[model samples]
Target chain A: EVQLVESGPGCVKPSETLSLTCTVSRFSLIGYAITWIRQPPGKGLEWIGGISSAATTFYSSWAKSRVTISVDTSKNQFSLKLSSVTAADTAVYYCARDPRGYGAALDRLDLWGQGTCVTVFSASTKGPSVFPLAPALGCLVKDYFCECPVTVSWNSGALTSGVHTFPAVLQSSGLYSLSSVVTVPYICNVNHKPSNTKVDKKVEP
Target chain B: IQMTQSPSSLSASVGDRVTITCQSIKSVYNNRLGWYQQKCGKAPKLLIYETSILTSGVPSRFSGSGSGTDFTLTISSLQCEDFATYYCAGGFDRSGDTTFGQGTKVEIKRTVAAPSVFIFPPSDEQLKSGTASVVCLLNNFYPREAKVQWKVDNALQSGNSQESVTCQDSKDCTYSLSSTLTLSKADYEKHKVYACEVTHQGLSSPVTKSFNRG
Candidate 1:
């Protein structure tokens, strides 16, 4: 139930924004994922991002932040916005229905141990932090043996912050990893209206 | 990151069972693999997707199977119209990428033929436009490819030609194609003889069908 038609300007000037919209039919935005993939006239295809009805987006670190994939629920369509385009960005854009969002295979296998559902900050809180809205454990379990001798894990980057605590216990190794350092110092002042209340940063470990 | 397709090209006859294999370098689940068909002048059309699920409108003879690292796209009974390139593509969540297998083309092995041709007379509306259109119909074609040309008084008329999309007649699995030559009605009436010439691989030479207008 997916038909995606991508349409945009034939050409765009240097440093101009390249915008494309994918009109979909016979599918609802709430139940499926749509991805924007592009290829230059003679180059390999590149993954831009995967967007879900859940509002959780997965983008290639390669495309960088210039690419934006968003959905319009009312119209049953999604759009991609790329900023500061150059000749290198000239390509044929395509929109495909990715039934599952990125990391779906790993997600299905329960490979990454679930992290806490990051709580939204109250309006009273001051500021934007890179804390994740999706639950991601600080250390991830790559492989696990049925409650016994085999298991391995590595840091999955700064898992959480904002006085938020992530406790990981390796029952076999008796090791614990937790970082109490907050990258952006929180301003507790009431009058300054500290920037934004959402946690938008992802502090690297 | 990619897939390897075997036997980049093969020769097969109509109604033969042909199998194409695609093996992905990266691990992919069953539903992530797809098969596509491409003709030289047309866009690639998806045959099977999500591994074995046939895309709607694709004929039942086409099927796909296999999972993980290995996959197969099989054409149960190849049609002459199917003698083109087939490609297998797989999308993996790994590193967030997708890839297409090198295409495998199926060409005619032994002698195969071309379209049968006929000429349809010009219409009154076309005659009034100062340009009369002589329609050429090529039907029941094998290998499903052709080129059509026209001549007025034995001189080639190359401009003002329109082609219809090839229509497949399901009854006998042959294709039907049409082309029109729109030329000055004055030239058409002025000339004693007008002809529709069809060039196809099945025929040794151009097949010419002539229509005389008073």
Candidate 2:
């Protein structure tokens, strides 16, 4: 039985480097892969990448390469590193067993490390990637789909934060600020996470 | 994507057979597992698992067992609390990335053959600083469709927008879709309750959750 434990600072100052790790005990670096994932405090899960034992390395196309995951075989653990930290990285990061090799059906996280949170804010960096609406008024449009389709966003040009979505709402499909209410079908695919095609980066305050 | 229900929507006096089917993209071959329930004004709670064993502290009425896409969440003797909603979520890898069939509502039958609605809840947490922010989890939503919005004191908060909800299922588990709202260093006594109202046609009333005074 292998277990994962995530270790890192729960709080960080902006522009600093945030480092975390997923340690697997009772196992070796052969025949199994390790995955790095993050969930904003009390948020849904985000896939970082995985170290393919058979592939002999770790990889994720979306990351900027500043983030790194390594193995300390002696310690029986793998590690995670995310640089250029912003408030956005303030989430719970964990590691888990890669069952894809065992022909394991993908859906059961039989084991989970207790989740931890990292809250980062601008001290000398880009101020805050989080843009707060100053007396900004937005409307609540009902979506019949079970999850978010397109990212829901609003902009005043000078003061705009990235699209803010709660766990209950789905994004994508071009639903911009104050859009109409409609029924969007929510289809469940094999991969729980859709590709992060989020362009039009958020404005830092 | 073709979902077949043995009993698409059933209404029995109290103890009737309710079988919810989730035809997987391919044969699950025994990996898919999980059942959840939500009564009125409450959060969605786990009902069954590993085909049998009722998760610790769960109500005895909520029983479960099955393999692959075939499963059941049975209320031995339907209680008023049991007639709210139920759903079949399948996944076995365990990365919190599971796909869920739209939930099944277990409400009282006003008429015959009336379809019940599924419900989702709001997930919130007390930040490290002790302040609270709520997360609107869409893990139950399918094909990646979901969103979240924040309102402070009834008016929309400024500078808040939607972000993409995409997480590659590394563990390939039953965990699914979700959205989030961050609120820290705010007054709890005034608002007292922060609501996460789930919107999905599957349910007649959007499910909601709030903080308790106790």
Candidate 3:
């Protein structure tokens, strides 16, 4: 049973490189591989990159140009380096192990470490904030699966921000609204921008 | 560069044959491919490698065939534990990369027939000391795995009991299992009655068999 733990900076400045390390245990790095995965808060998962024990690295098409994955055989660990990150890069990053083989294509990541959240921010940007448009609603049915839609609007608040909202199934439906005001730090641009943008969220129960 | 599997999921029963197909974009040279099995929340295990070679310690009932752009993994007789996700991976040595087909899950169909219960030793001999044994038998249950429990006087018994986790598969795919409980004669006589409770995923309620000293 191999284990992996990710360590990196809590935050990064725009145009700066983001470096992350995966400390491994219980297994030798002689023939295994490590992979990097990330999820923007409330968004779907993304595969970042992978590094084999033999030093071969594979990258996701989305990050192929900016992402670099490498192995540190002497430390029994692997590392990830992504350059020129912006607020869009803010996410909870995870380090996982490819269960077997040198090829990233033939393996699955079965083991994971608790994810580390990396926020890309700059001195000029206050960050992205979100709040519900109206009071939360409760559907009457209790015994069966229920789904409701919730809409949230954001101001981007003077900061140059890109607002993307995703709906969650409280249980069944795809769209949903927020229960309360949910504020997310680190919007895309560091400079000031326009205000009052909105997105729809679906919550299931 | 990539492999795709079809259907995503299907329902199956014990002794039934199941086949999964993997289609690749280009010719996968020298049949450098493999199959994997994964249960929910568990690590994937290698079932077959290098196209059609079975991994050591895997059951012979599992087999792989084919090469190049088309490959298939077939299970001759589905077992209870075979109800899980299967994945196919192809090694493209031409590009020094490996790619996997999305998983295909196997779900077990629910069993409809109920089990028949039997008890050994119509009556226990009257005695003040020593140990006596009682056996509870369940037959013709489908789906292989079922739970057997012993209880004294309607209360659940957590003590020692010999039981089988899986019963032998019959020609028709049904199973049979037996459980034995041993206790001191005085302890056995103290309980007003003893019961055997059988629980299976398909059963809405447990099928119970109760007995008395008589």
Best by DockQ: 2
lDDT of 3 by residue, B75-186 (tens): 9988867766788877676333555677787766545556666554222221322555565666656666778888888777765455542222323445555565667677
What is the lDDT, from 0 to 100, of the residue A135 in candidate 2?
12
Q: Write the per-residue lDDT of candidate 1 for residues A1-205, one digit (tens) a residue.
A: 3366665554345677767777766666776666665655434335577676466777777665798778888987677788887767765566665445542221111011111011111122222112211111111111111111111112233323322122222222232212122112221111111222222223232
lDDT of each candidate versus the true structure: 0.55, 0.44, 0.59
Candidate 3 lDDT, A3-44, residue by residue in tens: 777777655678999998888877777778776767666443
List the DockQ of the predictions in order. Answer: 0.02, 0.08, 0.06
Candidate 3 wrongly placed segments (more than 4 Å)? A1-22, A26-48, A81-205, B94-97, B112-214
Instruction: Provide the clashing-pair count of each candidate structure.
Output: 4, 66, 17
Worst 10 residues of 2 chain A by lDDT: A186-195
Distance from true position, residue A48, model 3, in Å? Answer: 4.9
For candidate 1, list the clashing residue pairs, or say none.
A129-A200, A129-A201, A130-A201, B130-B185
Candidate 1 vs candidate 2: which has greater lDDT?
1
DockQ of 1: 0.02
Chain A accuracy as TM-score for every candidate = 0.47, 0.51, 0.57
* Maximum-lDDT candidate: 3
Locate the minimum summed-lDDT window of 10 residues in model 1 chain B. B164-173
Better of 1 and 2 by DockQ: 2
> Residues B151-173, candidate 1, lDDT per residue (tens digit)?
77888876565554333333344
| C-alpha RMSD by candidate, in order | 25.7, 16.3, 21.0
Candidate 3 local lDDT, residue A77 = 73
